[PDB]
Design a protein around this ligand. Structure first.
Ligand code: MG
Ligand code: MG
Ligand code: MG
Ligand code: MG
Lengths: 125, 222, 222, 196, 212, 204, 195, 233, 195, 196
């Protein structure tokens, strides 16, 4: 198996691969979340250098993780699918064992844990 | 059980331990494994306890009637024949393993019978679960031309081997000496090398300790 | 077919006082109707004022004691030489036993010592790790003979105050070490009389705040 | 058991070891497996001790009652009585018996009766668990019309080998000589036969 | 064993006997068959002593880990399902358990779950588990109303175990009572059958089959 | 389906100074289910007492059988049967069913009216007599009874003391057996008076 | 077969017996009377092996009726129960034993007392204030241990019996199609039609 | 799960004042066939230990190789291999005992009963038993198979408890062992006349005796025994 | 477990499932719901080995719900039934197979048709107008062969179902404590509370 | 099978019958049970045909690879490889093998390996179902340091008897002579050996 430690510390104490991953996020289309008194609204930018798009079938920017929680993102689109899939699976697994849907904090904590794991595992970026 | 039989100068001696078991439990600490078939023919019995007693009593009964019928003292070979044919008939289901010995007009005799009806002859024999401990002693110390007191010593030593080394055997040594020209002498508890030590405490209860619900006089008269 | 288990007989007994605890066991080791050893100890000092016995199949018994002794050693290594309390030992032994739930250690386990308040403690385990603290427990071949006697003489079961109409129970009180050893000795001599796998010798390990002391007494060898 | 019977010039000799067994424990090391059913008709017993004793006892009774009415029975007759018992009770018996007797008309005769209760008249017969190991030896060494001393040596050497290999066999080698002269009992101890 | 737990107006009553047996040998008369998982959760034990003891104390550790990770006490539903999913993994291996997970939470209220070693998991108001379950049911069903007082409910639970302890040879020793409220569980004592039977017989007038 | 442990029950007998005691529990069950708490296992024929443990139908049958046989004995002999003689009758009767036995553990107790000697005896299901100076035990808690008796017993106890010893032997043995208990009866037997006492014991 | 119960009160014996006859996956009948009148003041209920039950019941019935005609007299409930026990005690060592469990409820006219006897197929007889055969006992005994009093009326006994049937109808796996209830007292045997 | 094929019978042993004696016959049985007669079942380890083995011979030969390898492995990087760090009897036993119990726990046992006899470095007698089940025990006398039933009772008459050991000489001990071997030849149907005997003494060391024979046997009385009851000739 | 029935009519699928949970000689519960909603218009009832049933049902439920969230779409009843069949067909050759029999009642919104699938533990799938698992079929199939018509209303289907439950309550040996009835149609899944 | 190997003055000779059996049907009457695992190391095979062939093939492979690296293997080494296979796979094998070879240092050597996988070095060895019948004969007739002609006669007479009594044995008597001179194959037909 490919083992290389790709995320490592530099002399100044930075993990450049993590910091460069943030640059990919900075390149991604803008996403905004605002919560009201009785709601949360997720807004997303879609770049207009792409005309002739089919918006019926093109992957939407906001994804349902369960019927009560949603996830939007900024950065690499392909990467986000892997996080969304894992989140959706954990959502169903939580309902199965706890007999209660995930809290938004728990679902977030899981997704963040996955992301962290990819910062100190060998062979992954 | 451990049981033995040993021939000597002018007769034969048999001996046995006195333990009775039900699985790992000692049911009887001083049971009698030496059986009188006739005044001068005695049996040592291992195996199923009720079987050895019943088959010994039945043949003993028939031997008495035979003795009365023939106006003769019973012979060991008659008891041997009657026991073996009875046991053979029952194909081993009557679990009696017997050492048959005694004196009669023909001389002194020592035999053993197996539950399925086989018999054998010897100067020294042992049966039961402790027979290997006993036979080890017999094979070590037996000789031709034993005296009465030497044979008793050898027999009881062979039983002791079983008492100490076989978990099936324990407690006391019973002996019966059958000498030609003399009365058979049954030596009940000839050795008692397993006396219980003094208990540390008396467990006598204060009177009134046991809670009682009812009392009544029982009528045993007519 | 190969049978991985055997039965090495013997019996063990644990009683707890106010500031002490005893763990006794006979020294006889058997297979079937043979004696392997008249003196093979199966009660052990495991360190930290914990005595332990695992009675039944000796190979499993020795393996368990060996593993627990080793567990005490590593508890010190991993937790700054901290003393392993009797309650923590009990819980640890449960995991040792239950770890082989589907291929069990064929033993009745008893440990004795002092709890964290200095009071006498006895813990007993089934073969797969179910445990319970008690004042009193007999284990092994003759457990069924000894335990009811202990209920009566240690916990005063079925004993009422005389003249109270079976309304006031005999009050519970701690026994002195002299009284406890009397009961142990009487328990084992009684067991020796009626159980074939129990005898030869009795070794008692007594546990106080001062350490572990031993006492040995002869038992009947038949 | 290792047992055998061998015919020769002057009659027939029977031979046997003295070991009786229960599993690997020797219940009797001085057993007598050579048994009289008539003055000069004897048998070698193998299989169950109880079965062979019970059969031999019944046969001896039958031949005693035969003799009382019709005089001395033939060896063939004795074998037929053994057969009748072994054949009709085949389901309940474990008995391998060799019958051997001396007539003055017929001289020495040997009949072997295996488990099923069949009868086989032979010049010599071997039987018992130990016999398996001496089929080769006995076939190679047996001759008809041997002398008494030759036949004794043949049986002694044969049973010696059977005893050597068969754990179920051992003790002393007993022999019974059946001739016109009478009945002779021979015994041979380990110290002699083991070093043959 | 005999164990029960029932729901009513004033919460949950949980009652158990204290006998352990090995065949016909009475091994113990003082076994603790209720395990206190947390101040709001109880577990009852029936079947294999080690199986129940080992895995229910293990369950307690899992419940503690939940409240450390989630900063909130575990639900009775989720606690019972940890145990049922565990034993389902061992299904066929030979575990022997009849358990009841009883407790109160805000979202659920008083709740009882039956969990056994072949993987059955059931929510319910009344259950009796063990070799004496039928004897306990007989008394409990024929006296149960939802509107029982805390005092009456405690007695009925105690009386139902006594009924089974008396009739079932493999039940006995003593009765351990528990009451579960919105504020948690409350222990209501160990009651030896030795004294409790005669006290109930005299005061209640029942047990006329027995020589007085 | 072990005939001797379907119904449950125990019997114990002891000798004292010029007296004998015989005691039994009251339980009759069907495996786990307790059915009756009035099932006495001790019977008497004249002054000879017989206790019987084991399969309850055989307990009943044998009582009826020995009542039958002792009644005919008395009519022909013109005297009450003695314990030693009755012991022999029990042994004969049981061995008669050698290969189809009654599944019982009988115990004889009584005082020989001629000699004044206390006598106790025990039997296996097929008739083997087990005579004892001290005590005989029987039933599903026989191991327990052996342990209780072997420790508690001392020779030459007075009737009132012997009562305490035999009662404590039975009670504590019964409480370690699932199939025994549910009440108890003790018989104290002197040369010409017999006292029967019911014991208070735990009912689980 | 399956459920047979019995309760002895102050002045009567009440027998309740299930009405179902099930074979395989079919309830063949829901009005079966699992009882026989042995004499005017003696009733026997029965449960067990198919065929065996009725065959044994009617055999006993014939014998008691024969006795009644011969002596112009009614056997006591105790006497009848002892006869029945002995027949079963014989049976258990036969080539093919009767696999039948019975309850005998009778009113002894000489004693003016109700009597209830429980006898299993082995020939195990006990006199009881209340009795049951089979799995029924596992629910009813504990229930009756609690609610039964020795001085109850026939009406109180019937209510006590309703409590047993209700419990069995709640917790028993099988549908036993209710019970036929019969009362045995000084005036003989009568059937309660509305239960 | 196994079944033993070629087997060795009893191994007998006892302690005396200065050391231990151990013996075993030279037979390799194949069921009832007494197949092999030159089989050595006592195996010395160093000059202070003898391991006596009964049961399956293929497994015995495996154990031989293990002990042989243990000697080799102990000598590695060990300047005191023939002095303070030589193999003790107690080390050899614990190793075998570990193996025996591990093999039974994997349901594939070495089908043997083993007695390890030797003298420790401090002069103490060592004698301990281990078998296919991993069961271990120690006693003044130890024996396997038929030896347990017939030899032990005889050897226990000489040394019945610990205090009897100082009172027992090597002459008395060997005499008892040699007698026990004779008794086994009378009574065990899978015994041979030829046997080996080893003495491990704290003063004279290891004495290994090969090609011993059972002698001074009583057979003469056999001539007087006829029939099985009533037969006279 | 034990009784699960299904009837497909003109516009709906009706599932009836017994309420009893029996272990040994005790009915532990009389209100058990032996069903899971897999999707808004798909319901699965189940019967079989204890533990296995609910474990399998909830496992399937999780998977279909996962699919629904991933694709923002509801699988057709046919698609769901095929997924379930394959899971059981895998299971039957596993070390320990799921011993669970299921009925799947669904309303296909694309076809505007009710659909009923019967699948046993082996993975034997059939589409049926009416279905049953276990011994229930031995009574209901012949009954439905006679009274069923393909154009019946939901109300007619419920009456037809009452006829089945009545027959089972008359001839079945065990007390299954009635049924919970659920209807699957164009508007989804709803429970009939008074049956 | 009846098989044997016998050491003598000039080396060692192996012998075997030629009968392969499936019940009482003779599947092969001309079998070759004497198998080469090396130039002058051979074996006699008894037990399962499949097992003994598979073992012999593996051993021959091992010794070929041994020879490539370390030169000619000793007969002891060959026996050890056989043992290793037979011992470690005892649960799944029915193979009774006699190993026989000629060194110039060690001359003739015979090792027998029974069912369990134990090794036994002997002057001569017999094995197979037919061996039972010639234990007596072979023990009585074997001498050490026999000549080639004497050893051939000893094996011929021995296997003749084994064949005569054992139904599982028969056909021809094959022999393989291992000496310094080389390897010689001998065959003896029924018409010769039956009338010995
Ligand atoms: Mg002993
Ligand atoms: Mg109870
Ligand atoms: Mg193969
Ligand atoms: Mg041939």
């Amino acid at each position: 198996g490919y083992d290389r430690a790709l995320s490592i510390f530099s002399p100044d104490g930075h993990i450049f691969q993590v910091e460069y991953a943030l640059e990919a996020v900075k390149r991604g289309t803008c996403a905004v979340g605002v919560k009201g008194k009785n709601c949360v609204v997720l807004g997303c930018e879609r770049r207009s250098t792409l005309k002739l798009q089919d918006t019926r079938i093109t992957p939407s920017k906001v994804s349902k993780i369960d019927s009560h929680v949603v996830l939007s993102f900024s950065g690499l689109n392909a990467d986000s699918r892997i996080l969304i899939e894992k989140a959706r699976v954990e959502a169903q697994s939580h309902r199965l064992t706890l007999e209660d849907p995930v809290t938004v904090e728990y679902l977030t904590r899981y997704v963040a844990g996955v992301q962290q794991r990819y910062t100190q595992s060998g062979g992954v970026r | 059980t451990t049981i033995v039989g040993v021939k000597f100068n002018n007769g034969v001696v048999i001996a046995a331990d006195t333990r009775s078991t039900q699985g790992p439990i000692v049911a009887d600490k001083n049971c009698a494994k030496l059986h009188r078939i006739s005044p001068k023919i005695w049996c040592a019995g291992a195996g199923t306890a009720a079987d050895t007693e019943a088959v010994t009593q039945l043949i003993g009964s028939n031997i008495e009637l035979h003795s009365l019928y023939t106006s003769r003292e019973p012979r060991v070979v008659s008891a041997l024949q009657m026991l073996k044919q009875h046991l053979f008939k029952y194909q081993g289901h009557i679990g009696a393993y017997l050492i048959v010995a005694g004196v009669d007009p023909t001389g002194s005799h020592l035999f053993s019978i197996h539950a399925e009806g086989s018999t054998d002859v010897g100067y020294y024999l042992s049966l039961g679960s402790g027979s290997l401990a006993a036979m080890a002693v017999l094979e070590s110390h037996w000789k031709q031309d034993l005296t009465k007191e030497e044979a008793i010593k050898l027999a009881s030593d062979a039983i002791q081997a079983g008492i100490w080394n076989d978990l099936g055997s324990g407690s006391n040594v019973d002996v019966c000496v059958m000498e030609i020209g003399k009365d058979a002498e049954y030596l009940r508890n000839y050795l008692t090398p397993n006396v219980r030590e003094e208990k540390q405490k008396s467990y006598k209860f204060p009177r009134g300790t046991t809670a009682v619900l009812k009392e009544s006089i029982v009528n045993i008269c007519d | 077919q190969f049978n991985p288990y055997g039965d090495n007989g013997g019996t063990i007994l644990g009683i707890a006082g106010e500031d002490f605890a005893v763990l006794a066991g006979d020294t006889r080791n058997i297979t079937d109707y043979s004696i392997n050893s008249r003196y093979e100890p199966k009660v052990f000092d495991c360190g930290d004022n914990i005595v332990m016995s695992a009675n039944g199949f000796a190979a499993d018994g020795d393996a368990l004691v060996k593993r627990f002794k080793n567990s005490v050693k590593w508890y010190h290594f991993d937790h700054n030489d901290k003393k392993l309390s009797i309650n923590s030992a009990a819980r640890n032994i449960q995991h040792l036993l239950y770890g082989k739930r589907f291929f069990p250690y064929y033993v009745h386990t008893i440990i004795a010592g002092l709890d964290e308040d200095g009071k006498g403690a006895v813990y007993s385990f089934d073969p797969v790790g179910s445990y319970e603290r008690e004042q009193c427990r007999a284990g092994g071949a003759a457990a069924s003979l000894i335990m009811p006697f202990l209920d009566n003489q240690v916990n005063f079961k079925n004993q009422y105050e005389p003249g109270t109409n079976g309304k006031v129970k005999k009050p519970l009180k701690y026994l002195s070490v002299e009284e406890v050893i009397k009961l142990v000795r009487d328990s084992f001599t009684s067991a020796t009389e009626r159980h074939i796998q129990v005898g030869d010798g009795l070794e008692i390990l007594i546990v106080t705040k001062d350490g572990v002391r031993k006492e040995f007494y002869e038992l009947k060898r038949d | 058991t290792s047992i055998m019977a061998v015919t020769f010039k002057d009659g027939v000799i029977l031979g046997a070891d003295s070991r009786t067994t229960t599993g690997a424990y020797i219940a009797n090391r001085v057993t007598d497996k050579l048994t009289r059913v008539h003055d000069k008709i004897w048998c070698c017993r193998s299989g169950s001790a109880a079965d062979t004793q019970a059969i031999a006892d019944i046969v001896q009774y039958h031949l005693e009652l035969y003799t009382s009415q019709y005089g001395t029975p033939s060896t063939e007759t004795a074998a037929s009585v053994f057969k009748e018992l072994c054949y009709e009770n085949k389901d309940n018996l474990t008995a391998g018996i060799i019958v051997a007797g001396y007539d003055d008309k017929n001289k020495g005769e040997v009949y072997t009766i295996p488990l099923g209760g069949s009868v086989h008249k032979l010049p010599y017969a071997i039987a018992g668990s130990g016999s398996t190991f001496i089929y080769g030896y006995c076939d190679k060494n047996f001759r008809e019309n041997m002398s008494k001393e030759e036949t004794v040596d043949f049986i002694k050497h044969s049973l010696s080998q059977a005893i050597k290999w068969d754990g179920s066999s051992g003790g002393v080698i007993r022999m019974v000589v059946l001739t016109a002269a009478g009945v002779e009992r021979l015994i041979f101890y380990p110290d002699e036969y083991e070093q043959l | 064993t005999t164990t029960l737990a029932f729901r009513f107006q004033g919460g949950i009553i949980v009652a158990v006997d204290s006998r352990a047996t090995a065949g016909n040998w009475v091994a113990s008369q003082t076994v603790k068959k209720v395990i206190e998982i947390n101040p709001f959760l109880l577990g009852t034990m029936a079947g294999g002593a080690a199986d129940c003891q080992f895995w229910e104390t293990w369950l307690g550790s899992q419940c503690r880990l939940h409240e450390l990770r989630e900063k909130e006490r575990i639900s009775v539903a989720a606690a019972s399902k940890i145990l049922s999913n565990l034993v389902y993994q061992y299904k066929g291996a030979g575990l022997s358990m009849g358990t009841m997970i009883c407790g109160y939470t805000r979202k659920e209220g008083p709740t009882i779950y039956y969990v056994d070693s072949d993987g059955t998991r059931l929510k319910g108001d009344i259950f009796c588990v063990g070799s004496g379950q039928t004897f306990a049911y007989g008394v409990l069903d024929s006296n149960y109303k939802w509107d029982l007082s805390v005092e009456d409910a405690l007695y009925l639970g105690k009386r139902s175990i006594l009924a089974a302890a008396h009739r079932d040879a493999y039940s006995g020793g003593s009765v351990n009572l528990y009451h579960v409220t919105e504020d948690g569980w409350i222990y209501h004592g160990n009651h030896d059958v030795g004294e409790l039977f005669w006290k109930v017989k005299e005061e209640e007038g029942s047990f006329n089959n027995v020589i007085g | 389906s072990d005939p001797s442990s379907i119904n449950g029950g125990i019997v114990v007998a002891m000798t004292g100074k010029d007296c004998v005691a015989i005691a039994c529990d009251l339980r009759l069950g069907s495996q786990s289910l307790g059915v009756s708490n009035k099932f006495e296992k001790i019977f008497h024929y004249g002054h000879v007492f017989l206790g019987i443990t084991g399969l309850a139908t055989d307990v009943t049958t044998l009582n009826e059988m020995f009542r039958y046989k002792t009644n005919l004995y008395k009519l022909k002999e013109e005297r009450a049967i003695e314990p030693e003689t009755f012991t022999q009758l029990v042994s004969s009767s049981l061995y008669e069913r050698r290969f189809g036995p009654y599944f019982v553990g009988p115990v004889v107790a009584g005082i020989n009216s001629k000699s004044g000697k206390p006598f106790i005896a025990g039997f296996d299901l097929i008739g083997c007599i087990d005579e004892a100076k001290d005590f005989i035990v029987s039933g599903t808690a026989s191991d327990q009874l052996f342990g209780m008796c072997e420790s508690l017993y001392e020779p030459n106890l007075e009737p009132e003391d012997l009562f305490e010893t035999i009662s404590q032997a039975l009670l504590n043995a019964a409480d370690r057996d699932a199939l025994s208990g549910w009440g108890a009866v003790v018989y104290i037997i002197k040369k010409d008076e017999v006292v029967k006492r019911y014991l208070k014991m735990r009912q689980d | 077969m399956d459920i047979i119960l019995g309760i002895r009160v102050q002045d009567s014996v009440i027998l309740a017996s299930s009405k179902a006859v099930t074979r395989g996956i079919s309830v063949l009948k829901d009005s079966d009377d699992k009882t026989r009148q042995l004499s005017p003041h003696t009733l026997m209920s029965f449960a067990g092996e198919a065929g065996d039950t009725v065959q044994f019941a009617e055999y006993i019935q014939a014998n008691i009726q024969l006795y009644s005609i011969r002596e112009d007299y009614e056997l006591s409930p105790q006497a009848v129960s002892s006869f029945v026990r002995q027949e079963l005690a014989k049976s258990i060592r036969s080539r093919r034993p009767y696999q039948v469990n019975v309850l005998i409820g009778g009113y002894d006219k000489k004693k003016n007392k109700p009597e209830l006897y429980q006898i299993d197929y082995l020939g195990t007889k006990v006199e009881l204030p209340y009795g049951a055969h089979g799995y029924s006992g596992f629910y009813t005994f504990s229930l009756l241990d609690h609610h039964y009093r020795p001085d109850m009326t026939t009406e109180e006994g019937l209510d006590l019996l309703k409590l047993c049937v209700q419990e069995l109808e709640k917790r028993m796996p099988m549908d036993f199609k209710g019970v036929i209830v019969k009362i045995v007292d000084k005036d003989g045997i009568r059937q309660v039609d509305d239960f | 799960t196994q079944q033993p094929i070629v087997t060795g019978t009893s191994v007998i042993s006892m302690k005396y004042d200065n050391g231990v004696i151990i013996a075993a016959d030279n037979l390799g049985s194949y069921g009832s066939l007494l197949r092999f007669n030159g089989v050595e079942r006592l195996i010395p380890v160093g000059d202070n230990t003898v391991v006596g083995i009964s049961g399956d011979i293929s497994d015995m030969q495996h154990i031989e190789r293990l002990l042989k390898d243990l000697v080799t492995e102990n000598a590695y990087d060990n300047p005191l291999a023939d002095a303070e760090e030589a193999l003790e009897p107690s080390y050899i036993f614990e190793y075998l005992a570990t193996v025996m119990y591990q093999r039974r726990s994997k349901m594939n046992p070495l089908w043997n009963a083993i007695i390890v006899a030797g003298v420790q470095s401090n002069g103490d007698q060592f004698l301990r038993y281990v078998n296919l089940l991993g069961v271990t025990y120690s006693s003044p006398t130890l024996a396997t198979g038929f030896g347990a039933h017939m030899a032990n009772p005889l050897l226990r008459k000489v040394v019945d408890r610990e205090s009897d050991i100082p009172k027992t000489t090597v002459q008395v001990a060997e005499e008892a062992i040699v007698n026990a071997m004779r008794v086994l030849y009378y009574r065990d149907a899978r015994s041979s006349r030829n046997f080996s005997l080893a003495i491990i003494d704290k003063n004279t060391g290891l004495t290994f005796k090969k090609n011993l024979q059972v002698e001074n046997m009583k057979w003469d009385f056999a001539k007087d025994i006829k029939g099985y009851g009533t037969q006279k000739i």
